[PDB]
Every structure is written in C-alpha cells, then in structure tokens.
Amino acid sequence: TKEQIQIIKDCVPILQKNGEDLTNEFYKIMFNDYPEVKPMFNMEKQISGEQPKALAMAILMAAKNIENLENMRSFVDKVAITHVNLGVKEEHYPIVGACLLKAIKNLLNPDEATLKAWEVAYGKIAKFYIDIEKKLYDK
Ligand code: HEM
Numbered sequence: 001t002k003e004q005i006q007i008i009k010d011c012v013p014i015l016q017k018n019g020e021d022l023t024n025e026f027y028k029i030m031f032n033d034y035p036e037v038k039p040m041f042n043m044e045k046q047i048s049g050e051q052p053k054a055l056a057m058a059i060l061m062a063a064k065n066i067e068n069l070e071n072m073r074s075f076v077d078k079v080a081i082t083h084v085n086l087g088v089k090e091e092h093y094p095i096v097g098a099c100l101l102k103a104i105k106n107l108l109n110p111d112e113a114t115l116k117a118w119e120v121a122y123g124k125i126a127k128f129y130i131d132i133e134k135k136l137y138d139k
C-alpha cells in the first residue's frame with residue numbers, strides 16, 4: 001500500500017520530464033493495435049503535441065493525487081465532458097490501460113514493482129473516470 005504509493009510519486013518527475021514521450025508512444029501503440037479508436041481523436045491535436053501533452057498532464061494529475069483521487073474531481077469532471085461527447089465507454093478503458101502499460105514498459109523499462117504499481121494505479125484512475133462518466137451518460 002505505502003511502497004506502491006511512493007513508487008507512483010517517484011514517477012511524477014519522470015513524467016514531468018518525458019511524459020509527452022510516454023504519451024507519444026501510447027498513441028502510437030493504441031492507433032496501431034486499435035485503429036478503430038483513431039477517428040475519435042483529432043489528428044491535428046496529435047501532430048501539434050497538444051493531446052500528448054494533455055494526456056501526460058492528466059496522468060501527472062492522477063499520480064499526484066493517487067492517495068485520494070477526489071482531489072482531482074474538478075479536473076476529471078471537465079475531461080469527462082469530452083469523453084462522453086465522443087462516446088468513450090467503460091469498455092475502452094481496458095484498451096487504454098493495455099496500451100499505456102505497454103508504453104511504460106517500452107520507454108521507462110521499469111522493474112516489476114513499478115509495473116505492478118502502475119497496473120494497480122491505472123485500475124483505480126480508470127474507475128474514477130468511468131464512474132463520473134457513467135453518471136453523465138445516465139444523469
Ligand atoms: C484514465 C484514462 C484517461 C485519461 C487520463 C484521459 C485523459 C484525457 C484528457 C486530459 C483529454 C483532453 C480533453 C479534455 O481535457 O477535455 C482526453 C481526450 C480524449 N480522450 Fe481520454 N483519457 C483517458 C481515457 C480515455 C479512453 C478510455 C478513451 C477512449 C478511446 C479516450 C479517448 C479520448 C478522446 C477521443 C479524446 C479527445 C482528444 C482530441 O480532442 O483529440 N480517453 N483524454
């Protein structure tokens with residue numbers, strides 16, 4: 001519980017320094033393996049680096065608040081509008097997780113404890129987004 005939290009915090013600086021590189025790799029993997037999701041995204045925003053930076057910043061936001069995701073509620077609330085408007089479903093979250101974890105393995109080449117810590121954190125972060133979005137879809 002505590003060791004895993006610290007590993008996620010330790011990764012904040014890594015993401016501050018090369019987060020965009022991680023997310024560039026994430027979108028490469030996802031668009032290659034799951035081309036069906038590509039049209040949901042604006043390619044202009046990929047080419048400019050804006051969306052890679054935005055995702056990296058959202059991951060940073062989650063890592064910073066990993067002990068209490070409620071402290072990113074006002075942030076996630078806003079991202080949820082984009083996701084719901086574009087038809088992001090609960091079932092897309094495992095796709096993102098698989099591609100993100102692979103990107104992490106590729107670029108950070110972490111130890112198993114770090115990989116495990118991100119697998120766990122992602123599940124929690126995804127659940128936070130899913131639950132807010134579910135309300136939007138149903139409310
Ligand atoms: C926990 C995982 C995720 C995080 C942290 C995340 C974060 C973000 C952020 C910060 C944005 C920028 C838009 C805004 O701020 O309103 C965004 C946009 C978007 N997200 Fe996600 N997202 C996640 C999962 C997903 C999933 C599962 C999908 C489904 C394919 C997805 C599809 C999109 C699309 C299509 C956009 C619009 C991008 C564009 O305008 O080009 N995201 N996401």
Ligand SMILES: [C-]#N
Nearest residue numbers: 051054055096
């Ligand atoms: C969302 N990327």
